[PDB]
UniProtKB/Swiss-Prot annotation:
Residues annotated as glycosylated: 58, 66, 93
Gene Ontology annotations of biological process type: antibacterial humoral response; antimicrobial humoral immune response mediated by antimicrobial peptide; chemotaxis; defense response to Gram-negative bacterium; defense response to Gram-positive bacterium; induction of bacterial agglutination; innate immune response; innate immune response in mucosa
EC number: 3.1.27.-
Keywords, sorted A to Z: Antibiotic, Antimicrobial, Disulfide bond, Endonuclease, Glycoprotein, Hydrolase, Nitration, Nuclease, Secreted, Signal
Lineage: Eukaryota, Metazoa, Chordata, Craniata, Vertebrata
List of catalytic residues: 16, 129
Modified positions (3'-nitrotyrosine) in chain numbering: 34
Site (May be involved in LPS-binding): 34
Protein name: Eosinophil cationic protein
Claim: ATP-binding is one of the keywords in the record: no
Cellular component per GO, a single term: azurophil granule lumen
Subunit details: Interacts with bacterial lipopolysaccharide (LPS) and lipoteichoic acid (LTA). In vitro interacts with and insert into lipid bilayers composed of dioleoyl phosphatidylcholine and dioleoyl phosphatidylglycerol. In vitro, tends to form amyloid-like aggregates at pH 3, but not at pH 5, nor 7.
Amino acid sequence: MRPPQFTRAQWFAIQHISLNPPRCTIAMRAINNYRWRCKNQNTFLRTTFANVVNVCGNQSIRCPHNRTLNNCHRSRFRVPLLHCDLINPGAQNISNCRYADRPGRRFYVVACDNRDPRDSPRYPVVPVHLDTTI
């Protein structure tokens, strides 16, 4: 559940955008803070927010993981990325969660939508969800 004080675009950037991510165990702290249980797996795209907004501007495709949505956008470039895999699943206290870091490199598919009133007016269409990476 997205914390109320963050728009869909900001929550998206907090969870998935980071050029130079710290260790997963550290990076994930701020995200799990708003969760009941630790996130099983999370992917950071090593790019900039500005660059994802561009993806938003191109050809539209049905969302792979939810074909009813026709506002998905695949990147044309494969982007380096960092996967954070939860080590202690359904086990270790959801307070001291540890993660394994895993490099990767692929195309990403994001779902884009109109900005929220509180978002920077600089971008009318913002990325709101990471659908998948291929």
